[PDB]
């Protein structure tokens with residue numbers, strides 16, 4: 313695992329994310345001024361929990377498809393056995409989607425991109441779990457404060473998937489190998505971009521896990 317190969321990998325993982333990021337950062341940033349009116353927020357608030365569950369389930373399913381696409385493009389992921397790909401995707405996909413959300417979140421006004429415009433947490437009132445939703449909003453708030461770059465997201469979310477301590481892996485060693493190379497890649501690129509400081513401010517992997525389990529329950 314040499315410097316040029318590690319840099320090959322960094323570039324490779326960032327290309328994969330770019331090709332699978334769902335919406336361009338550029339589009340998200342300039343749409344920030346397109347905010348749901350009071351009448352539209354009320355329109356979403358009036359909807360049944362069952363309709364909101366369906367809309368959200370739809371968007372979430374779509375987001376996971378992009379994450380699977382992302383995984384398929386990661387060097388070595390396809391070389392893993394069929395069972396380990398499932399184990400990694402089942403445990404990790406939703407955690408990736410949660411990290412990806414921070415790109416669509418605006419800390420200035422505490423709003424997120426949903427169905428063509430930005431709105432705040434009150435948009436999801438009909439689901440009837442505001443604790444879960446504010447804590448998701450708080451999570452996305454923390455990551456926006458770091459100013460997570462596209463390539464940071466790519467590299468961090470690669471590591472969220474390729475975790476060799478997910479229960480049920482048949483080839484633990486092959487996954488550790490891949491994890492380690494992605495760890496070197498992540499750390500090398502932080503050096504290169506003078507972004508070492510973000511490591512200590514990342515959320516603990518347990519926080520990210522607990523938050524997805526709570527989401528899964530509802």
Ligand SMILES: CC(C)n1c(=O)n(CC2CC2)c(=O)c2cc(NC(=O)N3CCO[C@@H](C(=O)Nc4ccc(C#N)c(Cl)c4)C3)ccc21
Pocket residue numbers: 334335367368369371372375406407409410412413414416424425426427436445448524527
């Ligand atoms: C329930 C709600 C507060 N919520 C939300 O809870 N999460 C995190 C949970 C999946 C782990 C979001 O990431 C999220 C993102 C967004 N929007 C995006 O990040 N976008 C970028 C690209 O995709 C578009 C999109 O609609 N994405 C998506 C993904 C997942 C879920 C869910 N559930 C929904 Cl409703 C929409 C727009 C909106 C609400 C989210």
